[PDB]
Coordinates of N, CA and C and ligand atoms in Angstrom, one line a residue:
X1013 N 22.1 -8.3 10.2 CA 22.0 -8.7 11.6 C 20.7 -8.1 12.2
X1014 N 19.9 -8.7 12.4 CA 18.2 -8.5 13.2 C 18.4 -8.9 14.3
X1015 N 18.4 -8.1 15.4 CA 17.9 -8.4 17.1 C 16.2 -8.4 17.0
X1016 N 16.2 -9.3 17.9 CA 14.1 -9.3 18.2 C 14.5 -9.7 20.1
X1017 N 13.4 -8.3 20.3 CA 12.9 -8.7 21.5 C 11.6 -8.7 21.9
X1018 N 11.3 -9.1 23.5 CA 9.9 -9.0 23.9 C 9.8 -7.8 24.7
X1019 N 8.2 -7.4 23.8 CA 7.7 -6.1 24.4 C 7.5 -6.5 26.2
X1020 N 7.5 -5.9 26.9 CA 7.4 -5.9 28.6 C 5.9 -6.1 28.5
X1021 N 5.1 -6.7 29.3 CA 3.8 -7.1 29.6 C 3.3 -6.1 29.3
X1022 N 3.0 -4.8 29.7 CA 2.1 -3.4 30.0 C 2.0 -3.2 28.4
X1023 N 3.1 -3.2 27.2 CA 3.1 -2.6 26.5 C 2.4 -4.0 25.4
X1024 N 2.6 -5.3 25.7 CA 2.0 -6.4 24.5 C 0.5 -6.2 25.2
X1025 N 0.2 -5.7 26.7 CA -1.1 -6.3 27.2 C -1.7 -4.4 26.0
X1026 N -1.5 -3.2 26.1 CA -1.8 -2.8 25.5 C -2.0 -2.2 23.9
X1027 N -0.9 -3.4 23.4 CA -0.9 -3.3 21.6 C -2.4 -4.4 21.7
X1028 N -2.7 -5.4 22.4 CA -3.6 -6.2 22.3 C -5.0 -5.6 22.4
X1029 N -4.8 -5.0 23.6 CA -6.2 -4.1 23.3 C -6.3 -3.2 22.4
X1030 N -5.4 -2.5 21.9 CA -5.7 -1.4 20.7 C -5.7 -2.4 19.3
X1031 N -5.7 -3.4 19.5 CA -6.0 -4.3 18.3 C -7.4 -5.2 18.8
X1032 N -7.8 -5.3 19.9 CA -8.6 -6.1 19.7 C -10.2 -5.3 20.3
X1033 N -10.3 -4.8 20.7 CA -11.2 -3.5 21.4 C -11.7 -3.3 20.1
X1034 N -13.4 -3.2 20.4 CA -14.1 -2.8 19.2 C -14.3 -1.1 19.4
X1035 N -13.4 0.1 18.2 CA -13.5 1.3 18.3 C -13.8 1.9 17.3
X1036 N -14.7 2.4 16.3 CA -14.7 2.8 15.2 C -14.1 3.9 15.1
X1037 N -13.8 4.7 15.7 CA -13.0 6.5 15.8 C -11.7 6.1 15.7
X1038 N -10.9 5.5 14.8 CA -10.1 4.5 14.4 C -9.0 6.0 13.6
X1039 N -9.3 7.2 12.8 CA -8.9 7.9 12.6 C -8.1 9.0 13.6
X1040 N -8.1 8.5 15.1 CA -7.1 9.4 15.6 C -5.5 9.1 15.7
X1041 N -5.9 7.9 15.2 CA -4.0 7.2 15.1 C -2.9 8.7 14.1
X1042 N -3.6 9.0 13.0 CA -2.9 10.5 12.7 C -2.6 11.6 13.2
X1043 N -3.6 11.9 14.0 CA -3.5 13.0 15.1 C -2.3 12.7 16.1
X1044 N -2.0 11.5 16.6 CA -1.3 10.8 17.9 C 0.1 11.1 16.7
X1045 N 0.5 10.3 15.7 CA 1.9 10.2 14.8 C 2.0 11.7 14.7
X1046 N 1.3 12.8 14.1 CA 1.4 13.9 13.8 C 2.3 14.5 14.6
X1047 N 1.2 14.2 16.3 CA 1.7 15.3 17.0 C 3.1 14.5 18.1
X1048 N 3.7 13.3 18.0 CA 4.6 12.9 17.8 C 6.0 13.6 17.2
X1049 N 5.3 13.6 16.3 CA 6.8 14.3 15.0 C 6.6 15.6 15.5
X1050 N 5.7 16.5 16.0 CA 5.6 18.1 16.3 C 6.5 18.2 17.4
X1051 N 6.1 17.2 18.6 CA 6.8 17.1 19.4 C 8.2 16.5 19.5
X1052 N 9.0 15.8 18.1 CA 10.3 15.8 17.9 C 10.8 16.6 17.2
X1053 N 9.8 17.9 16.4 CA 9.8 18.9 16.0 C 10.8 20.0 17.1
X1054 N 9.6 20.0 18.1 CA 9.8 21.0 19.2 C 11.1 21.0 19.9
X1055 N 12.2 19.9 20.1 CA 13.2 19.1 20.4 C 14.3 19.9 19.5
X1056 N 14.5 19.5 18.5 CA 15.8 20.2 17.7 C 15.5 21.4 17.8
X1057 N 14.6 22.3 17.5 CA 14.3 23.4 17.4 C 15.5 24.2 18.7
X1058 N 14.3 24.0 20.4 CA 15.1 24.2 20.9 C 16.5 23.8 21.1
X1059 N 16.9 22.5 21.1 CA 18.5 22.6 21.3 C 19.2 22.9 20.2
X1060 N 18.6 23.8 19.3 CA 19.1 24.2 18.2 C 19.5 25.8 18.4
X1061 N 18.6 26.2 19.5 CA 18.7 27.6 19.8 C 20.0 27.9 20.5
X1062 N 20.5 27.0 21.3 CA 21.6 26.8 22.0 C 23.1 26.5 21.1
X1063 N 22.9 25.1 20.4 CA 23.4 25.0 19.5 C 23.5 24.6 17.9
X1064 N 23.6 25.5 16.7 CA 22.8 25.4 15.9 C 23.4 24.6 14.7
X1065 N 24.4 24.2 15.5 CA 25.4 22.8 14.4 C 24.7 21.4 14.6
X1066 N 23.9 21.6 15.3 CA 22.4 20.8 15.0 C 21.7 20.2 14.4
X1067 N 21.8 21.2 13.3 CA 21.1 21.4 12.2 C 21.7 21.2 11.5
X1068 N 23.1 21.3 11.1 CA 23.9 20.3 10.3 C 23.4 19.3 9.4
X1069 N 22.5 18.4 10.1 CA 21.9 17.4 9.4 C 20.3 17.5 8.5
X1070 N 20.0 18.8 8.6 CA 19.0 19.8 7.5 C 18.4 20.3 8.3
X1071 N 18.1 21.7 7.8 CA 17.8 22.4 8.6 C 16.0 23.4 8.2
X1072 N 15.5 22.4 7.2 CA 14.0 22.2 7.0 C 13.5 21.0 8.6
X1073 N 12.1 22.2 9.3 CA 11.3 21.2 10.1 C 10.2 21.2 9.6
X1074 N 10.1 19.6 9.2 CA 8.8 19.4 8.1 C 8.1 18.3 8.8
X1075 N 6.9 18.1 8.5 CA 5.9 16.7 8.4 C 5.4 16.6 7.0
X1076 N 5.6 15.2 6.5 CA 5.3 14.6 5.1 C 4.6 13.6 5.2
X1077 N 3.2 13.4 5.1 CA 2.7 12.4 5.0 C 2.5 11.6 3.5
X1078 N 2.9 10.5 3.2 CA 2.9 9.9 2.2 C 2.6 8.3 1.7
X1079 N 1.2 8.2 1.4 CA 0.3 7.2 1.1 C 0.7 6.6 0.0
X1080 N 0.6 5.5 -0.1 CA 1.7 4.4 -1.4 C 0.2 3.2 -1.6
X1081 N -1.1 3.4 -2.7 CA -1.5 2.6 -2.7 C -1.5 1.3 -3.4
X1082 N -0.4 1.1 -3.7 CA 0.1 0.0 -4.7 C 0.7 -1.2 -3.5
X1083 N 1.9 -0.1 -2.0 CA 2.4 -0.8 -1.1 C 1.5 -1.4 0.2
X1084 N 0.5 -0.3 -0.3 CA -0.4 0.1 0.4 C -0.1 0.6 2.1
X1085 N 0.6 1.4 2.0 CA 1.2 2.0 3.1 C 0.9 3.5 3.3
X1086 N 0.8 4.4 4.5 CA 0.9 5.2 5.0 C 2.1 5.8 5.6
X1087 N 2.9 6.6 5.0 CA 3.7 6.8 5.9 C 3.9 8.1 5.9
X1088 N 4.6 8.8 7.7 CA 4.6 9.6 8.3 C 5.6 10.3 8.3
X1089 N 6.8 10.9 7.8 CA 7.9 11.4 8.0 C 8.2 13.1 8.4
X1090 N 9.3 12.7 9.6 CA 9.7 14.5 10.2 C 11.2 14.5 10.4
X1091 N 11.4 15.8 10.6 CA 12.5 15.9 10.3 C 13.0 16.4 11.5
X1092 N 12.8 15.7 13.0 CA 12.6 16.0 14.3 C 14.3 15.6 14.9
X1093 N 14.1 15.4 16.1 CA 15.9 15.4 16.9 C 15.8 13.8 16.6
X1094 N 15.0 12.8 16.0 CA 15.6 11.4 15.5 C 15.3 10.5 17.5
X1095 N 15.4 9.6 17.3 CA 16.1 8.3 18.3 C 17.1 8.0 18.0
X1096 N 17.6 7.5 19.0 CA 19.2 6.9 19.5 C 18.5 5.3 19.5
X1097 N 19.5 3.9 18.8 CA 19.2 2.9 19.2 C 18.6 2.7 20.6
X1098 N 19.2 2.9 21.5 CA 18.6 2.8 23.2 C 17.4 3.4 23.6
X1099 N 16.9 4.4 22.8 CA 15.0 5.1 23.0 C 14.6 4.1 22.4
X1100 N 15.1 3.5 21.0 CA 14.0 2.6 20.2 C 13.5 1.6 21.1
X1101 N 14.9 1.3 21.6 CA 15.2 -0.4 21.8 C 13.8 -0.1 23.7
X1102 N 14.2 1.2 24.1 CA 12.9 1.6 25.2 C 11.8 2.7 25.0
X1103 N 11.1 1.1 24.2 CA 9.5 1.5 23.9 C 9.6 3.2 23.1
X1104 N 10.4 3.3 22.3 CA 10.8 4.3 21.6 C 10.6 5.5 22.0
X1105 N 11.3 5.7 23.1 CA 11.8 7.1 24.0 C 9.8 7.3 25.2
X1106 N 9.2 6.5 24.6 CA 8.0 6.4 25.8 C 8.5 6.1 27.4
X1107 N 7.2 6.8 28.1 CA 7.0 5.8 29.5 C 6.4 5.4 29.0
X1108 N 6.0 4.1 28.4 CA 5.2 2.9 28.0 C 4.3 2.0 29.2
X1109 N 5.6 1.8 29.8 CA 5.1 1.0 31.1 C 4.4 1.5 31.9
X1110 N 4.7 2.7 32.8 CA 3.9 3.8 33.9 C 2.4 4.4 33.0
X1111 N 2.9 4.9 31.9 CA 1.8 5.4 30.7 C 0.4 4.5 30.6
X1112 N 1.1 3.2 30.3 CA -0.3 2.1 30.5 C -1.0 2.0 31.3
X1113 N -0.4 1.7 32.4 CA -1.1 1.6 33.4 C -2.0 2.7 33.6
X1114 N -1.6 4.1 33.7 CA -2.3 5.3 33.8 C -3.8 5.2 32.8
X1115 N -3.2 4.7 31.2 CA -4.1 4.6 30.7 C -5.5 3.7 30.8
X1116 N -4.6 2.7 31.5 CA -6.1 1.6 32.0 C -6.9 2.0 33.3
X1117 N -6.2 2.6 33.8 CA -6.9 3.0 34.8 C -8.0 4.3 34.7
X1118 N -7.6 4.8 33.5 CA -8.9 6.0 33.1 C -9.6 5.6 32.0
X1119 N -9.3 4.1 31.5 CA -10.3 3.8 30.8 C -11.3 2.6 31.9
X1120 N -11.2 2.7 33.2 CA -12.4 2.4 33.5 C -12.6 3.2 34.6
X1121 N -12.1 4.6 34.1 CA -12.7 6.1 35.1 C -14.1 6.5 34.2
X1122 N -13.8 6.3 32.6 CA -14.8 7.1 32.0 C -13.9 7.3 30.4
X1123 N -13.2 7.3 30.4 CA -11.8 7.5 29.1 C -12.4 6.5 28.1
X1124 N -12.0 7.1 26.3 CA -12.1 6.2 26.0 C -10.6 6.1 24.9
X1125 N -10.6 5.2 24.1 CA -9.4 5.0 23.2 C -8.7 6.6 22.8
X1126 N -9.3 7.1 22.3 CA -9.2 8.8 22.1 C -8.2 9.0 22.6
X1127 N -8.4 9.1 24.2 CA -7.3 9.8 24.9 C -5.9 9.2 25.5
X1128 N -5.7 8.4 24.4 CA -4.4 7.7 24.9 C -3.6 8.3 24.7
X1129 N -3.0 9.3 23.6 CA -1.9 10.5 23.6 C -2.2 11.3 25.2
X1130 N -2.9 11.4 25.8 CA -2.2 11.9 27.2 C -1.7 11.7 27.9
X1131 N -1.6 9.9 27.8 CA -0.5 8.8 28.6 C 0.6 8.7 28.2
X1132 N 1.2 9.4 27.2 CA 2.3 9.4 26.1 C 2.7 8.0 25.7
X1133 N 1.7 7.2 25.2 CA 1.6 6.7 24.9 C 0.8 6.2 23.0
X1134 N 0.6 7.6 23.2 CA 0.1 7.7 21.8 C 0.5 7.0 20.2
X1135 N 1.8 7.0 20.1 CA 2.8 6.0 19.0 C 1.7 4.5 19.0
X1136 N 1.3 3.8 20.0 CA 0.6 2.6 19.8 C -0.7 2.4 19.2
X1137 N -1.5 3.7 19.2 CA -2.8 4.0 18.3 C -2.2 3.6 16.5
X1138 N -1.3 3.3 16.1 CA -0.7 2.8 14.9 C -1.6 1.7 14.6
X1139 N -1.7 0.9 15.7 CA -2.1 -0.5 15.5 C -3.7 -0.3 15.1
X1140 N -4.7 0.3 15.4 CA -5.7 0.7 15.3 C -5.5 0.3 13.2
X1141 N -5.0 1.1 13.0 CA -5.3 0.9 11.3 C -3.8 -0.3 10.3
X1142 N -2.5 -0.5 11.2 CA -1.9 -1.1 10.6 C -1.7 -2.5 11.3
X1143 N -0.9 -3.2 10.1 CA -1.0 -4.8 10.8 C 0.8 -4.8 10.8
X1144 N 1.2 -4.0 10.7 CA 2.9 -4.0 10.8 C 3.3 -2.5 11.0
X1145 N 4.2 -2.4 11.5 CA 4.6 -0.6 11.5 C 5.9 -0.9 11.6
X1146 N 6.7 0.0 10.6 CA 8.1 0.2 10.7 C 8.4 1.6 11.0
X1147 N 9.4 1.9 11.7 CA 10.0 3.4 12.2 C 11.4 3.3 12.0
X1148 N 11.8 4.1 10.7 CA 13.3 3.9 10.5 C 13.9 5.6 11.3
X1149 N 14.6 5.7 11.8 CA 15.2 6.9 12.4 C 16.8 7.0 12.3
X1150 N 16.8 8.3 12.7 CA 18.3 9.1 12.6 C 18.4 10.1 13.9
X1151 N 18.8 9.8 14.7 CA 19.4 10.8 15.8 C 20.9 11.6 15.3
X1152 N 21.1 12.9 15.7 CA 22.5 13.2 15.2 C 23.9 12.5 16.7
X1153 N 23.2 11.7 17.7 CA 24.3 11.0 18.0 C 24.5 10.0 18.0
X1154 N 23.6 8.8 16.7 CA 23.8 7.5 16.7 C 23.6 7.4 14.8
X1155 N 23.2 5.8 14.9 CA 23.4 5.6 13.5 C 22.1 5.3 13.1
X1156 N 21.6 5.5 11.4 CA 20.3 4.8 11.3 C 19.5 3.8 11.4
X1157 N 18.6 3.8 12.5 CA 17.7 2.1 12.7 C 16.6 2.0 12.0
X1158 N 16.2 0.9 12.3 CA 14.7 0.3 11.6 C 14.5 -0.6 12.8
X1159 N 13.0 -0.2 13.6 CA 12.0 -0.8 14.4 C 11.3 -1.3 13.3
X1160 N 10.5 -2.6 14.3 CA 9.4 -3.3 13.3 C 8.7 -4.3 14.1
X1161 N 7.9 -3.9 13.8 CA 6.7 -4.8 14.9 C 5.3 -5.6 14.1
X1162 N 4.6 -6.2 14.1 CA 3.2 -7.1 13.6 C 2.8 -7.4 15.0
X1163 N 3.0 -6.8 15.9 CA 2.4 -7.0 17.4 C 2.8 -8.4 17.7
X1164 N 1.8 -9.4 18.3 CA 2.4 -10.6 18.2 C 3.4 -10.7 20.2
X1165 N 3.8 -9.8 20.3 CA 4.4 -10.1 21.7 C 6.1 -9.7 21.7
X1166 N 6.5 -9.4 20.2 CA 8.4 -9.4 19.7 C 8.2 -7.9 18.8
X1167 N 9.6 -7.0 18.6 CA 9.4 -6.1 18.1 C 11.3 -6.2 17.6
X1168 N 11.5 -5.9 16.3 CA 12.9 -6.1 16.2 C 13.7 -4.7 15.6
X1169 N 14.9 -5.1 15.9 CA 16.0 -3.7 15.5 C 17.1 -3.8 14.9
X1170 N 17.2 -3.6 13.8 CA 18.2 -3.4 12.5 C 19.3 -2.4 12.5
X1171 N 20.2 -2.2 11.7 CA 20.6 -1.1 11.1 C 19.8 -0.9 10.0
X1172 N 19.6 0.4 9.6 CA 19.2 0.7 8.0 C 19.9 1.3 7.1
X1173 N 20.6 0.6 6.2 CA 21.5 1.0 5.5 C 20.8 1.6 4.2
X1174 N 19.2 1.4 4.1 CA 18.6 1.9 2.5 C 18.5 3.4 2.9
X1175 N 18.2 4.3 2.3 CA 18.1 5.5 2.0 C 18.3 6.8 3.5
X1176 N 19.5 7.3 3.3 CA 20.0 8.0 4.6 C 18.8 8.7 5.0
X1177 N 18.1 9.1 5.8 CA 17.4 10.3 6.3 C 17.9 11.6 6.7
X1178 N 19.6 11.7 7.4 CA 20.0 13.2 7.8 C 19.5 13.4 8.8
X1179 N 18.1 13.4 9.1 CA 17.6 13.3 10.7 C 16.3 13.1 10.4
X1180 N 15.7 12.6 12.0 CA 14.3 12.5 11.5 C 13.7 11.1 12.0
X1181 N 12.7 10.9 12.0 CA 11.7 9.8 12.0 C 10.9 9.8 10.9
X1182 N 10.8 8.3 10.7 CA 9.9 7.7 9.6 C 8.8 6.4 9.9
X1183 N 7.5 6.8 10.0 CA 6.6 5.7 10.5 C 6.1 5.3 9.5
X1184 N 6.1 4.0 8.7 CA 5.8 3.4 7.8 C 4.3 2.5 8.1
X1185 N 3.2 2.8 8.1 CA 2.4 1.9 8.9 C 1.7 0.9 7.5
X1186 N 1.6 -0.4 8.0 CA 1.2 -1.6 6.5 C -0.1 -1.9 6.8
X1187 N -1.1 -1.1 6.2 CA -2.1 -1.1 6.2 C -3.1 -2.4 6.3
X1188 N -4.4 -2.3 7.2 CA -4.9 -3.9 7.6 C -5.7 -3.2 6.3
X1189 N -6.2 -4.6 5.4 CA -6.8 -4.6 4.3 C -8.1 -3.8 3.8
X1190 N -9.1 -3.5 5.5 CA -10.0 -2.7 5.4 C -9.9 -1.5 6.2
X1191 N -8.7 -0.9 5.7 CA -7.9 0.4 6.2 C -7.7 1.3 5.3
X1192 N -7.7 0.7 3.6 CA -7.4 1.5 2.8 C -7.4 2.8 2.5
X1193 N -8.5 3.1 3.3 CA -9.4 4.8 3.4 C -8.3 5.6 3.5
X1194 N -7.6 5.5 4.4 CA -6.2 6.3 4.7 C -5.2 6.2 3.9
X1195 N -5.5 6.0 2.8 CA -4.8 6.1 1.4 C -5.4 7.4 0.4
X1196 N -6.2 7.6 0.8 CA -7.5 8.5 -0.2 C -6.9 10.1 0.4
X1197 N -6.3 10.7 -0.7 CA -6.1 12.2 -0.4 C -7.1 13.2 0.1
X1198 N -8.4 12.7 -0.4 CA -9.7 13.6 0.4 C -9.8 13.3 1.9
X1199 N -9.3 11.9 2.5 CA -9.8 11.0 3.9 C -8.5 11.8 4.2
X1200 N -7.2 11.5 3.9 CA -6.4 12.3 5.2 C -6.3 14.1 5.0
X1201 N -6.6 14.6 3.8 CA -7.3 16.1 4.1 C -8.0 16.6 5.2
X1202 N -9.0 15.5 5.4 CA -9.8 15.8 6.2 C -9.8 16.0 7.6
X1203 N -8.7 14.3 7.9 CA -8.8 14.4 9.3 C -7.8 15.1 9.7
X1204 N -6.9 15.8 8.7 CA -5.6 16.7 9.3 C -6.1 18.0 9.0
X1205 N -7.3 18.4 8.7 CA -8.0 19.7 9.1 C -8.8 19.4 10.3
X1206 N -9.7 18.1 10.9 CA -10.3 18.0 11.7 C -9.4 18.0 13.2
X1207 N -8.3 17.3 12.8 CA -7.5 17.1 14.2 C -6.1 17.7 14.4
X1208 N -5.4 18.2 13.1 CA -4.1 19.0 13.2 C -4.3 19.9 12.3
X1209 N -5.1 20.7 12.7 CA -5.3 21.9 11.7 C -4.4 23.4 12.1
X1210 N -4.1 22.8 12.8 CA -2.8 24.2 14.0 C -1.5 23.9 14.3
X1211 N -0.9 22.6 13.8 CA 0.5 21.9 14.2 C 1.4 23.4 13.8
X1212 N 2.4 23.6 14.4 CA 3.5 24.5 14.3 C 4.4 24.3 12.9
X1213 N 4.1 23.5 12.2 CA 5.3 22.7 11.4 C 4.3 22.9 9.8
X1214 N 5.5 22.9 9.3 CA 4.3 22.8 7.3 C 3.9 21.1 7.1
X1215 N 2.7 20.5 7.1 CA 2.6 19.4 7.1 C 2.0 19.4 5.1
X1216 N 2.9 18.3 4.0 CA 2.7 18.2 3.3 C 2.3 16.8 2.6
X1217 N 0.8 16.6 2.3 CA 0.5 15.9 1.4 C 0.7 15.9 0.6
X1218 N 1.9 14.1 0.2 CA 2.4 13.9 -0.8 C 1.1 13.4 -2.2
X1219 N 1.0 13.1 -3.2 CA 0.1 12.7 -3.9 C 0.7 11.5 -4.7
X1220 N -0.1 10.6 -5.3 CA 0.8 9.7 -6.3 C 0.4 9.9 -7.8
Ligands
4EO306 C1 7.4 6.6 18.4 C2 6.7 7.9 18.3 C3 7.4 8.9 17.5 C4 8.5 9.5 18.1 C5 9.2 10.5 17.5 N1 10.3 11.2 18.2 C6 11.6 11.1 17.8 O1 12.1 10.5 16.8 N2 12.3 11.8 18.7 C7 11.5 12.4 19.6 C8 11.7 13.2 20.7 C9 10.6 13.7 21.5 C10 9.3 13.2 21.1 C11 9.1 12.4 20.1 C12 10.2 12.0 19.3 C13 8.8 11.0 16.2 O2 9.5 12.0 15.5 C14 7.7 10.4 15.6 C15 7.0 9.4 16.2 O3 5.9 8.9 15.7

């Protein structure tokens, strides 16, 4: 059973421009995912301090980035406080809507694509290098989903019954055909020393 809905204007009018806006600095979409997962990092942690049956569901806080050039995918995995179907299902726990706006409005202050993680809106910089993005997750108070989007205007929501996670977010991004770069162990070396070279968390490059 697949539900598909429509993204709210603010958020299809802004997947459109981060797909259609000519930006070559196209490499901050990792920095935005990274510090994502830091920031659902930072989440269990604390309510873990309080309560530490929390952790129940593993109690390693990791980032794994893991490049598949056969699937030709990038993907992002952490082992953060997860989504609940209802964050996914709203613009996945974003202000998306209020965020955009903010965003458009400093990109004709002087702003440019770069600074869209300070609208918390950052998760949409995906589209910059993929032509589909899947986010399978595990909250410890719901069940495992799968988001999935090819932009387009519709974004849908599953259960995911393939491979449990325990907790965590998983951003799967399907690489656009002259994106491959982000497959190359030297290219994401680089830009996760250039732009997350200080994340709080052990971030590990998987290899194939
Ligand atoms: C959708 C963006 C995104 C979101 C999360 N995320 C969650 O899954 N829970 C979060 C709680 C606070 C902040 C970000 C969170 C993540 O772990 C990775 C991501 O790329």
């Amino acid at each position: 059973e697949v539900e598909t809905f429509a993204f709210q204007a603010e958020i299809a009018q802004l997947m459109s421009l981060i797909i259609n806006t000519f930006y070559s600095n196209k490499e901050i979409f990792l920095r935005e995912l990274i510090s994502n997962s830091s920031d659902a990092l930072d989440k269990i942690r604390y309510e873990s301090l309080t309560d530490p049956s929390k952790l129940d569901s593993g109690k390693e806080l990791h980032i794994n980035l893991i490049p598949n050039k056969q699937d030709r995918t990038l993907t992002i995995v952490d082992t953060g406080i997860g989504m609940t179907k209802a964050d996914l299902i709203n613009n996945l726990g974003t202000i998306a809507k209020s965020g955009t706006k903010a965003f458009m409005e400093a990109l004709q202050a002087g702003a440019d694509i770069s600074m869209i993680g300070q609208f918390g809106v950052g998760f949409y910089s995906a589209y910059l290098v993929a032509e589909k993005v899947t986010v399978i997750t595990k909250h410890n108070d719901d069940e495992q989903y799968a988001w999935e989007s090819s932009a387009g205007g519709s974004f849908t929501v599953r259960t995911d019954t393939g491979e449990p996670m325990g907790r965590g977010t998983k951003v799967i991004l399907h690489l656009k055909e002259d994106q491959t770069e982000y497959l190359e162990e030297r290219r994401i070396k680089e830009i996760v020393k250039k732009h997350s070279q200080f994340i709080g968390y052990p971030i590990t490059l998987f290899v194939e």
